[PDB]
Amino acid sequence: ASATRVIQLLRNWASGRDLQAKLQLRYQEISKRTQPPPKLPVGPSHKLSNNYYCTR
Amino acid sequence: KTSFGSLKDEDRIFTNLYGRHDWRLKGAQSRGDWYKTKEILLKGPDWILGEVKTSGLRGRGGAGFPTGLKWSFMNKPSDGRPKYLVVNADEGEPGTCKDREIIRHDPHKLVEGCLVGGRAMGARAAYIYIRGEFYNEASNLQVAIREAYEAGLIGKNACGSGYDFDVFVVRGAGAYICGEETALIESIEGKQGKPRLKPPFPADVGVFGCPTTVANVETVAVSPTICRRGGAWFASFGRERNSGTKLFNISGHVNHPCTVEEEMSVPLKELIEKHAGGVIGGWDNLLAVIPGGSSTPLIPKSVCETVLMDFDALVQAQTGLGTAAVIVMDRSTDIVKAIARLIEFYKHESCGQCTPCREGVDWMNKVMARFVKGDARPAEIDSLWEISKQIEGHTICALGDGAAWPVQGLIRHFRPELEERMQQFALQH
Ligand SMILES: Cc1cc2nc3c(=O)[nH]c(=O)nc-3n(C[C@H](O)[C@H](O)[C@H](O)COP(=O)(O)O)c2cc1C
Ligand code: SF4
Numbered sequence: 001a002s003a004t005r006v007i008q009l010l011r012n013w014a015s016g017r018d019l020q021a022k023l024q025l026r027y028q029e030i031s032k033r034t035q036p037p038p039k040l041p042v043g044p045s046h047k048l049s050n051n052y053y054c055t056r
Numbered sequence: 057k058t059s060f061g062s063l064k065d066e067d068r069i070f071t072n073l074y075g076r077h078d079w080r081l082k083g084a085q086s087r088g089d090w091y092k093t094k095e096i097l098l099k100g101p102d103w104i105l106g107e108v109k110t111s112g113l114r115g116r117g118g119a120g121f122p123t124g125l126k127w128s129f130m131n132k133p134s135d136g137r138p139k140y141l142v143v144n145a146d147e148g149e150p151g152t153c154k155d156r157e158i159i160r161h162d163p164h165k166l167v168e169g170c171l172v173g174g175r176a177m178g179a180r181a182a183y184i185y186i187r188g189e190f191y192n193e194a195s196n197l198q199v200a201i202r203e204a205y206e207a208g209l210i211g212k213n214a215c216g217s218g219y220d221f222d223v224f225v226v227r228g229a230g231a232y233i234c235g236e237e238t239a240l241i242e243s244i245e246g247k248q249g250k251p252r253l254k255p256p257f258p259a260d261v262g263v264f265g266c267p268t269t270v271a272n273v274e275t276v277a278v279s280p281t282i283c284r285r286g287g288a289w290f291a292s293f294g295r296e297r298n299s300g301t302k303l304f305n306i307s308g309h310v311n312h313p314c315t316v317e318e319e320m321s322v323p324l325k326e327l328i329e330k331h332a333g334g335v336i337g338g339w340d341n342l343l344a345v346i347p348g349g350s351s352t353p354l355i356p357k358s359v360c361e362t363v364l365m366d367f368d369a370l371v372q373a374q375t376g377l378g379t380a381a382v383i384v385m386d387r388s389t390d391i392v393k394a395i396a397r398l399i400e401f402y403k404h405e406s407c408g409q410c411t412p413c414r415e416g417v418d419w420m421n422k423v424m425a426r427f428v429k430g431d432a433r434p435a436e437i438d439s440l441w442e443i444s445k446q447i448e449g450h451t452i453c454a455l456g457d458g459a460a461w462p463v464q465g466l467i468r469h470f471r472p473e474l475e476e477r478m479q480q481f482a483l484q485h
Contacts, residue, residue, distance in 0.1 A: 049438035 001025065060294060060364070061322030061330070063301055067293065068317045069281045070303070075161040079196060081203040084164035089280070090209055093168055096283050097175045097217040101131055104176035108279060110287025112299035117144055117235075117272030118348060118378040120367045129259040130177040130269050137266040141179035143170055144240055145186040145273050148232035149349035150401055151381030154303035154315055155273035159186065160193040162277065163200035167223055169276035171210055172283060174221045177269055181222035185240050188228040197225055232405035236453045237270035239407065250409045251453040274303055294320030298366035302380045306332040309342075309386035321366040328384060336386050343387045344469065348378020350398045351458025353465025354391070374468070392474060395466040396424040402459035413456040416447040420463055427474055430481030437474055441467050 001023050003011070012019050045051055065071075071087045072079060084090055096104065109124030116123075130139060143166070147155040158166060170182040186194045201223050204210040212220045231249045233239050238252035241263045252258075262268020278300070282290045291299045298320050304327055305315045311333030318327055324345065328334060335342040344354045347365065352375045355363065359373050367377045385394060403421040408414040423440050426432045444460035444467075451457060467474070 048435045049442055 001027075057292070060319050061326055063293065063317065063319040067289075067301070067319075069278050069301060070158060070162055070165070070317050072161045073157055073303075073315070073317060075157075079161050079163060080200065081164055081207060081209075084162065084200075088284075089162070089165045090168050090204075091284060093171060093209065093280070094215040094217040096172055096280065097215060097219050099283075101176045101178060104172060104279070104283060105131055107283045107287045108176070111282045111290035112287075112294075112297065113275065113278060113282060113290060114298075114300070114367065115272065116274040116278075116302065116379075118149065118351065118376075120377065123271070123275055126259075127173065127177055127269060127271075129257070130179075130267055132267075134178065135267065138180040138264075139178050139267045140263050141170065141174050141177060141182040142237075142240060142244070142263055142268055142270045143182060143184040143273060143276050144235065144237065144270050145184050145190070146228055146232070146235040146240065147187060147190075147273070148235045148405070149351065149379045149381060150398065151305055151307050151346065151383045152349045152379035153305050153307070153381070154379070156190060156193055157303070157315055158273050158277050159190070160196050163197045164204065165280065166197070166273060166277045167200055167204050167210060169279045170223050171214055171219075171221050172279050173269075173271065173276055175217075175219050176279075179221070179269075181224060183224040183226055183244055183263065185226045185228060185234070185244055187234075188230050191227070194225055194227055201225065232401075233407045233453070233455060236455065239453065240270055241268060248407075250407045253452050295364070295366060295368070298364075298368055302365070302377065304331075304365065305379070305381040306384065307381065308384040309336045309389065310334070310384045311336055318365075321364045321369065324360055324363045324365050324382070327365055328382065332382075332384070335384055337388075341386045341388075343385045343389050344391060345385065346375075346383040346462075347373075347380065348376050349381040350383070350401065351454070351461055352376045352378045353461045354385075354395070354469060355465075356469045374465070390428070391466060391470050392424070392428045392477065395462050396421070396428045398462050399424045399459060402455060406455060406459075407453070410450075410452040410456065412447045413451045413453070413459075416443055417456065417459050419443060420447070420459070424463070427477070430477035430479075432478050432481075434475050434478060437467055437471060 008020055077083045105124055105128045113123040115121045145155055174182055209215055210223055214221045226244055228234050234243045234249040236251045237258055239249045243249040244263050258268050293301050300320050301317055302320050303317050307313050316331040342357050344356050345360050346354050347370055355373050355375050363373050370376050399421045403417050406413050406417050444463045448457045448460040
């Protein structure tokens, strides 16, 4: 977070924990909204043989 | 007898098979045909059927069903409908070119067979459905029939025996499906050549809705010789349940492609080498052989090395005698392409009536073309096997089964070639 070192120290002391380590606000660890095109897999019955529905 | 295939010229039913003599009545009678036919007819229908059973004659059209029993099916008291007999002369099975030889070179033998069979089954008349392409053979057959009519061999008081029998010839119009017995019946009746669904069996309801029996040209033509020479004579040749002499239309990659009458249960390699001069390039150059026309599955060279050309032995070899049209394929043959061509033949000769045949055969043809190009995946081979199994046994006629069998044989014996071709195609792209 964009806070002065003094403010950070006061905040951590008042909380009693190092808040800068785990800040609730999300900055850059977020995943990119634009992602590579996925290729989802097929199921166990996506076969051209021994796939008779009577057996499943 | 343990070693078969030593048939002598004194034991060959078709003596003018090569057309080197007079096909007309004079030559036929000089060769022993049309001999004491009156006594044969007066002997009794039961006697004739018993002689056929003693000979152990089985269906020479490909089914292999015992001919004596099949003909005995129609030896019943008349139901009021005029009984008829049909002689299957379509010969549409690829590789099968025997019936043509019989009709064109010994037509009077076939006519005498028709008379004897009709007497044995109490048939009013016989309709020989010949293939339309066999126009000259049909002309020869008609000339023979005219000669028989004028000589009194057939017609009213046939051979002076009192039996009133007629022989009709109906030309086809280019349909392999017409080879099927019920499809043949429908074609004669004037409808599209689409096979019926048994029951009713043809013996009960057949041509013109009358008791009818369909028999192969060879099957009918051997009946008078079987009667005259005795059933024991016919039985002596061939193993038990595989007795007689079968015409072998050796064709393909052989040095001397020809049709030869040889004893049943003859070793395949012997038959190929004895008459056709062996496989082109030698025995080792052979790839595979289709023993019976095209419907029967192929047998690889390993099995071809030691196998008897009879019904039972070939059944053990995952194939059948069928029409005994040996199609020899050398190792310069793309087996995939050949089987695909056969599948295409079936596709272009399917009636289209039954859904499995109509759609599955075309689907298999597409997949086979893709296999020939290698444009596929290895699992598609198992998929094709499943498709063939689905078609087989689920169709009105046996055309679907006889089209599934080649694919099954190709997979079962040369799957490595298919997989390797697919690999090669993948590497190219
Ligand atoms: C697709 C198909 C084609 C056939 N083609 C012929 C043929 O060309 N000639 C023939 O004699 N039988 C052929 N048959 C067999 C006939 O249906 C019938 O069983 C046979 O003509 C009777 O022979 P058989 O009485 O000597 O046993 C064919 C069968 C099928 C299913
Ligand atoms: S397996 Fe067929 S669609 Fe057929 S009665 Fe047929 S030529 Fe057929």
